[PDB]
Amino acid sequence: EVETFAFQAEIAQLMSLIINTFYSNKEIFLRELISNSSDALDKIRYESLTDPSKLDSGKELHINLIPNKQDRTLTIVDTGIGMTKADLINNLGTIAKSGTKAFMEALQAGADISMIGQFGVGFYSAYLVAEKVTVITKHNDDEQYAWESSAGGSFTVRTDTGEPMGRGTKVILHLKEDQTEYLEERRIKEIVKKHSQFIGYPITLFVEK
Numbered sequence: 001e002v003e004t005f006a007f008q009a010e011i012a013q014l015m016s017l018i019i020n021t022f023y024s025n026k027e028i029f030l031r032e033l034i035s036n037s038s039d040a041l042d043k044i045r046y047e048s049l050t051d052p053s054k055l056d057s058g059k060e061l062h063i064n065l066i067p068n069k070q071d072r073t074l075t076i077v078d079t080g081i082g083m084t085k086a087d088l089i090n091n092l093g094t095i096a097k098s099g100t101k102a103f104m105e106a107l108q109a110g111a112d113i114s115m116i117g118q119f120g121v122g123f124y125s126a127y128l129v130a131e132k133v134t135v136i137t138k139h140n141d142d143e144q145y146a147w148e149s150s151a152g153g154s155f156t157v158r159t160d161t162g163e164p165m166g167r168g169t170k171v172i173l174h175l176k177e178d179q180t181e182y183l184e185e186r187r188i189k190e191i192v193k194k195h196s197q198f199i200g201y202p203i204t205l206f207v208e209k
């Protein structure tokens, strides 16, 4: 059973701007997703400070980067607080409507796409490099769900019957044909060292056979 939703007009406009604008500095997508993961890890850590049972779904707080050249996917896994179904539908837990409004004024007032994260909509920079994005998520207060969009104005949400996650979020980037450099180990290492050197959680770059 799959539910199909329309993006809010303002979010559809944000996504088409990211996809259509000529902008060479695409590598910032990874900084933005890692920062989102760090934010989600901060949230579950804070909750566990007064309620240790919040970590019964997993004590380890970490970020994994998993390239797969056969599937042409880059997966960013974190064990953060995760998202409920309501969070997923409500623009993946963001205030994307007002964030987009602010972001798009900044773009006409000088800024560039790389500054997207300051407006709370950094997730959508995934469409700089991905033709399709799948988000698998598990929050302590809900079931495991899969969100998916190839842009084009709609997304789907379904109950996820795949591998149970315990707690957290998995962003699966189905990369564009000309963006496979972000599956190469030395390119990912360079980007993490350049933009994410001070993230306070272990970032593990998986290797392939």
Ligand SMILES: N#CCC(=O)Nc1cccc(Cl)c1
Binding pocket: 014, 017, 018, 019, 021, 023, 100, 103, 104, 105, 107, 112, 113, 114, 116, 124, 125, 128
């Ligand atoms: N807001 C707004 C419009 C805008 O320029 N968005 C944009 C464009 C290219 C890349 C990114 Cl990451 C974002």
